[PDB]
Design a protein around this ligand. Sequence first.
Ligand code: ADP
Lengths: 48, 291, 322, 319, 290, 49, 97, 330
Amino acid sequence: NGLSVYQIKVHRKYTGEDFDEDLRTVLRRSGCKNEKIAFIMDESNVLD
Amino acid sequence: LDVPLVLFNEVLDHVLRIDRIFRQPQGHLLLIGVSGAGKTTLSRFVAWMNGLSVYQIKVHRKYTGEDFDEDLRTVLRRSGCKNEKIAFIMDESNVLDSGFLERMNTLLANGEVPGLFEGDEYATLMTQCKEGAQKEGLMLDSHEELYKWFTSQVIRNLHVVFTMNPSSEGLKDRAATSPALFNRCVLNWFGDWSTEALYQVGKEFTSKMDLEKPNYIVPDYMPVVYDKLPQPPSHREAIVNSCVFVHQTLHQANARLAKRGGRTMAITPRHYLDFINHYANLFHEKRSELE
Amino acid sequence: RDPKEWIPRPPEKYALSGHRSPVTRVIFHPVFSVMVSASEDATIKVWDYETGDFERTLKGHTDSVQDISFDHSGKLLASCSADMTIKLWDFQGFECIRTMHGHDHNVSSVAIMPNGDHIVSASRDKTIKMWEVQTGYCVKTFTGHREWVRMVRPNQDGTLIASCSNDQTVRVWVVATKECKAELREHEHVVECISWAPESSYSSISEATGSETKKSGKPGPFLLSGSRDKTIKMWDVSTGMCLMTLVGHDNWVRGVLFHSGGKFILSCADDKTLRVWDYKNKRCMKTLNAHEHFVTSLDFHKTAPYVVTGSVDQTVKVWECR
Amino acid sequence: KEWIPRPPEKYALSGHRSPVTRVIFHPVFSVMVSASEDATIKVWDYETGDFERTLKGHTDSVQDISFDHSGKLLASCSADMTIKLWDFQGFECIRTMHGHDHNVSSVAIMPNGDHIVSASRDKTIKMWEVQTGYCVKTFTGHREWVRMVRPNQDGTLIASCSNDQTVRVWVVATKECKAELREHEHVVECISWAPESSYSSISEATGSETKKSGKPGPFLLSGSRDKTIKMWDVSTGMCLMTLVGHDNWVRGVLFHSGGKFILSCADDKTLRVWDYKNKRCMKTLNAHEHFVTSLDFHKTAPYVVTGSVDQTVKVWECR
Amino acid sequence: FNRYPLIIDPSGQATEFIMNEYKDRKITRTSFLDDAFRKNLESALRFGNPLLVQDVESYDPVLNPVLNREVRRTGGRVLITLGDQDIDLSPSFVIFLSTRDPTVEFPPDLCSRVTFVNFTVTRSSLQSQCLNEVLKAERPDVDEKRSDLLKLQGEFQLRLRQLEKSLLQALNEVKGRILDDDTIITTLENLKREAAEVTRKVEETDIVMQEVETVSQQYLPLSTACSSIYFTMESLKQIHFLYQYSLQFFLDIYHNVLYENPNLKGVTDHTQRLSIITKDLFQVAFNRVA
Amino acid sequence: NPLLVQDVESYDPVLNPVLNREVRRTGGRVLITLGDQDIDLSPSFVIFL
Amino acid sequence: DFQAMGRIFVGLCQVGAWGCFDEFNRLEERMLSAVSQQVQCIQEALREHSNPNYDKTSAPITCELLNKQVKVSPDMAIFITMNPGYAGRSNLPDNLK
Amino acid sequence: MSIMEQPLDLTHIVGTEVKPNTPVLMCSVPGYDASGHVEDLAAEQNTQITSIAIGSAEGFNQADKAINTAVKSGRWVMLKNVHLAPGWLMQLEKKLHSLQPHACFRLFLTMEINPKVPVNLLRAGRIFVFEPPPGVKANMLRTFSSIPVSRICKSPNERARLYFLLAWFHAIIQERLRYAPLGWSKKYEFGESDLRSACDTVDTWLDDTAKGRQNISPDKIPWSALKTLMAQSIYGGRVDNEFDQRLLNTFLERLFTTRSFDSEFKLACKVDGHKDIQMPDGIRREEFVQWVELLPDTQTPSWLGLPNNAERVLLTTQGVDMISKMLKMQ
Ligand SMILES: Nc1ncnc2c1ncn2[C@@H]1O[C@H](COP(=O)(O)OP(=O)(O)O)[C@@H](O)[C@H]1O
């Protein structure tokens, strides 16, 4: 469909601030740059 | 770094001198000597000893002032914000423009470049400095004392090493184009390898070679080249003296060739190292083939 | 056979099949009555389209060959492959005279500039590079695309190059000064193919789109862009506006080009069909069930009435136009 | 077309460790396939003489290999009493049909591309299915070892040559030997039928009279160890012409793609091209230092390959 | 060489010699003026391919770790840090730097990092070239005779060396005593008879080489004059910067005086032709240079 | 460089592309996108947890 | 530079005006060399305008200035005023003089 | 050394002795250019030539495009004042080396004798030095070779005599520059442009006076017009000294009079103390050219009106310089 797949790269030090930065990146790309993005995330990526 | 080094007295003296500066705040070095003398290798080794991280700018044909500014921003961010001890080894061949010298002068003297960070870069620098001050236990909010803390961190952490060949006119011009290069930098005159250094390198490298001749007759008029050569020299000592004489002969050869008006290439200690390596390899090969 | 009105017809002339892998691109020799087809088996087979007989295979590429092009004289052939190399072929002796490295990833397009002294190539490292034919040196590097650049094509005089990328945009560059003249972003998917408008179609395009005659007399270079949203769009490079959108393909458009007379548009897509577009009325005249699998490329002979299409079914077909 | 091999060569491919038994051409790709006696089938690129791959699934010496019309399958027979069907897209054995006691000599896929024929020492010719793998009908009537088997251009007629001096033509539908030919001086070894491009060229070459239907009828040929090559009429069963002059036992025979010349190999270490309509072409061309085993003619390309006992495969230019 | 060489050959003969020596190793000829020099360098470093780089006056400082051999060995690999990315240095890699400018100046660091190999034109080599050229122009049969003689002498000496080495190897590889096995005696007799035949061939080639030499003695003064003329032309740069003349200039002068000489249209005497050639050599050298 | 990684109870979710073999061929043979860096995968690599 | 002088020349050619360029040697030597080409083109266009066979009913005389065809009026002229005694001023190339 | 005195035959050298891969470097002393010579050569050979003046970036672009086109199409390329771009000259030399141009391709690089010209470029190409002709005889030979034959031989038969007088005046004026303080007050730029302007003036005024007649009277030639124009605009324009202008007026009034058509007219008086240069009696170009070619080898400053000792110190200095040059390359 032409969407750009985005997946957050979590790790042991992945905290809320990193997740907020990833959200800011995705929202900037998909709202300012008019980019279609498929934000794929798993339940294991929900650390909080 | 997996490069073999032959240790002589001057090497120990120079590594001690370099180690002295790296342990001082705002300790910058100005190493002066012929290329291939080991200035960069010794600086990297001593920086490894003291925990410093060696940084060198990757200059190329298309390198310009903006690339140097970006490299300076990277070095300053690592040294000040991240509290990292960095040895900034920079050579005279890295100076493609006088703006490089202006930035270097300001950084060496003041410890910061007032206009290096601007706009988005300045905001990112301030955020990183706030994080670093929080990490160090300081509570700093306004930009002024944050920048002051960054400057203090850079002064305490960043060490700059300058290596350049001994050009008299070049030295005189650099004494004015970069005044902080001669006031904020400790000048170490490495120079060329001395006759004693050449003799020690030849003795150490050719030690594994046999070079033993019990029936060697000492000539009445010994062509002494190394002053501290023993009066009844052995065969090995004579061989090393001949090697030193060969190097000095190339020096005199270039002197005479340049006197007439020809184009000469500089003879470096790397020439002597290649000479002794070739001597060892040829000796081994010829001995093996003859046997 | 009106010398500027023929269109391909359903009954094929030949179905040439010697490739062991999907045929990537097919081109016509500008001078000789011979044909060149590149495929994914790292081979460049050469065919004659008058009698439909295989002639010789040009090998030397390690991985799949993605594009091939001829210079104006037809004496040199430039091919790019998936092994990150560009090879220049002496088409008289059929030997590879020069191999050019420097791209960091798959090189998916190549084109020889109209003067014949430079080679322009696009690759997956999001860059477009220019190579001297004589020395093989990389002399320019057009950066700015955010994704894999799929095609690069110079205009008639070689002063402009257009490119399409996976970033769903078409960029028009200036060869002399490297600047990006225009950024044509209206496709809703990845742009597959591009093509420039010949000067014989300028008046037809102008009177079909209703564009008033400019005081200069030059309507402005026109460009096409087939993309994966199953649409073909005609652009005005001078103003950056999309003159028309051509709808009717059932799948991703793979190749697009003008009739040499500049009266129709020929396009092929993955819907297994080759379509003839009457851009006068912005509608499709003829649909040809070209191949039994995806159709990857097409070419239209400048003078002779022949159309050739390659396909993923490893078959090259020659179409008589009547 | 007047394609004729020339004494100079381009590549002498030598990768086999055992004598080569047969060589064939791929229908569509620029691929040449050679079966040898080391239980392996090798794949070559005759255009540039580069080794490509080997298919080492067989147990004993591989005897005969054959493609189908599409060239997507490769049927192989060996002395291990089995017929292996190879998938030429992935080059992996997909079906190994068993039975057919004792050494299997020949194999062939009829143009319909759904069934296989095979000849063996057990004095019978079997009929297999590509899709399933069951031998459905068995051909009996040969009293000795059947050497070569070759079908027609539309999957209806089959000829089998054997040591019993008989070349019996068989029918798919009726399974009856409608034509039995026992006239050769010594062992018959190789057979090959006539393409439709040469049917007209036989009328003025022999003077045969057309029947009421007007068609000259299907045509035959059978080479034999008696150093004589003889072409036969399938419809009638009578002799057209006997080609004589080979020094040693003949092992392979086939027709020129243009249907004008006769080109064959034999144990005389030489390749011989013969004309029959006018008896003008009698070119003798040495090919290998030892016995020459098999050969093939490219349908469209000007290339011919020959396999020999010297473990070498050679490619000749046609000019 | 220990340090990687930097070749200086204005004539370009050393470059083609290097390309021919490393042809079997797939040597790639690149340049510092190529924007894709980094990619070729990294490919050669990773895959161990010989590399020849031209236009060294535009030297790229990215080669500094490669020329200095600043390798880091860890995990059995040899890591070279070409810029910012690590590359496994294959031990078969070698790089040659070349330039066509004999007057180019190099910074002292580059002078330290490379071994200078200078291909200058000597008086003896130029005399030999001029003598061979005049022999080919005037006495082509003698020229081809001399070429065949040189090839034969080279082949014969190689055969003699091989026979001597094989004789030593045969005497050294015996598992016991010579007369114990007859095959050793067979091999020794074969080697000795081959050596005798090759020595006879060497002697006959030597006498025909003697006659070839004695017919070429007449053209020696012309070659000496040619060498003197060229080395006078080369020294004309001392009185003016504009008097820069290459070897190809003098070679073109020689070719013109040999083959494109009007004064040789109907003259067939060898001595007369030689005198005319010398006189017109001086005249044409002055006319073109001045 | 075969690797052995202990303490898998604190698994680091960065090996997921490596463990899933999420590679693509061509343009450098086997390419693995470890995070944001397009690493080139060595066929001799193996990891034990 | 070359571009500015070319544009001024285009304006003077189209208007039909006299261009007096004082202190002409204050330009760089390379710029003077480049400008010599445009001056020569304008002078050739003027010269081919003066031949008797030219007729005003035919196509007007044009010259190539800045990659454009610019009509050259017969009334225009180029005058340069220089002080050659000032050290540091550029030396006009021989093709321009 | 007699070839060096003749005018340079660019046609033969360019056609035969110059390979297409070798650029034709034409270095000239200040005051001389080789552009006109090459344009004339291309015109006489009916060869298209692209002339580009180096000094602008778009100039470099056109130079590159023209070279690329010509190496394939076999045309000629001119690049003038290339001494102003030494780095681009090195780049061009590197480009020229790896090149296989057409058989008829020729590249002419017009520079002056400048120490900044790269040495590798000088070695790559063939150098031709353009400078003042060695003497009066050579100067008249060059002047007569430059002017087309059909241009001198027009309808009036007196045009050839006027052209010979103009050539002699040009040679005398230009050879006086070798003696800088004596011949003139400063090194004036008397060159081919002045000669061409004077020739055009002579043609225009002779055509205006002689309305196509085959012959004209010697007194009917517009002597005053030619004298005034050549003293005020053509040759006297460069003169900024009143005494240099007086000398030019003296030469013009001595040469350009109706007495110059007399059989006993004296071009110079007492050159060696006894002999003097004599006005040729011919009426066509060939006779005057033959007279020029018959001029004695020996030349003294008395040919120019200067004292014979005006060249003594210069000759001594040149001899010492020749000795030093011979001793500098031993
Ligand atoms: N004491 C030494 N013994 C042996 N080799 C040395 C020594 N000092 C320097 N070298 C050689 O010099 C090279 C590095 O020289 P470097 O320090 O870069 O020169 P510079 O001082 O001009 O920067 C190394 O490859 C090393 O082999």
